[PDB]
Structure 1
Amino acid sequence: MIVPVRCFSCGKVVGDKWESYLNLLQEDELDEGTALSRLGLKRYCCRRMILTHVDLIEKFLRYNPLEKR
C-alpha cells in the first residue's frame, strides 16, 4: 500500500527513494531503468522493490475521513 522501508532480500533502505523515483520519471524525462540506477539501486533485488511497487495509498486518501477533528 505504501513504499516498503527496507528491501526484502538484503535490507537496504528503499523507503526514502519513492519520491525521488517519481520525480526522475516526471521531471527528468528518464526511463525507469536509468532512474533506478541513478538512485543507487544496483542489485536487482532492490530494483524490483521500487520498480514493481503499487501506491494504493493514493486511492485510499480519496475517501473522506471517517472521523474528522
Structure 2
Amino acid sequence: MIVPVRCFSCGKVVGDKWESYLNLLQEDELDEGTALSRLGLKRYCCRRMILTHVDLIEKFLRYNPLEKR
C-alpha cells in the first residue's frame, strides 16, 4: 500500500527511490525502464519492486481521519 523499504529478493533499499521514480515519469517524461535504470535498479528483482508497486496509501489518505487532533 506504500512502497516497500527494501527489495524482497536481495535487500536493496528501494523505499527511498519511490518519490524520485514518480518525478522521472511525470516531469522528465521518461519511460519506466529508463527511469528504473536511472535510479540504479539494475537487477529485475529490484525493478519489479518499484515497477509493480501500487500506491494504495494515496487512496487510504482520501478518507477523513477518525481521530483528528
Report the TM-score range of the alignment, normalised by the length of the smaller protein.
over 0.9
The answer for the alignment partner of 1:58 in structure 2 is 58
Provide, for residues 1-57 of structure 1, a one-character-per-residue CA deviation record: whole Å limited to 9, x for no partner. 100000000000000000000000001010001000000000000000000000000
Runs of 4+ aligned structure 1 residues displaced above 2 Å come to none
- Across the two proteins, how many residue pairs are aligned to each other? 69
What is the TM-score when the length of structure 1 is the normalising length? Answer: 0.99
User: Partners of 1:2 and 1:53 in 2: how far apart?
Assistant: 8
User: Partners of 2:36 and 2:13 in 1: how far apart?
Assistant: 14
Gaps of 5+ in 2: none
> Sequence identity of aligned pairs in percent?
100
Gaps of 5+ in 1: none
User: Partners of 1:23 and 1:45 in 2: how far apart?
Assistant: 22
CA RMSD, Structure 1 to Structure 2 (Å): 0.3
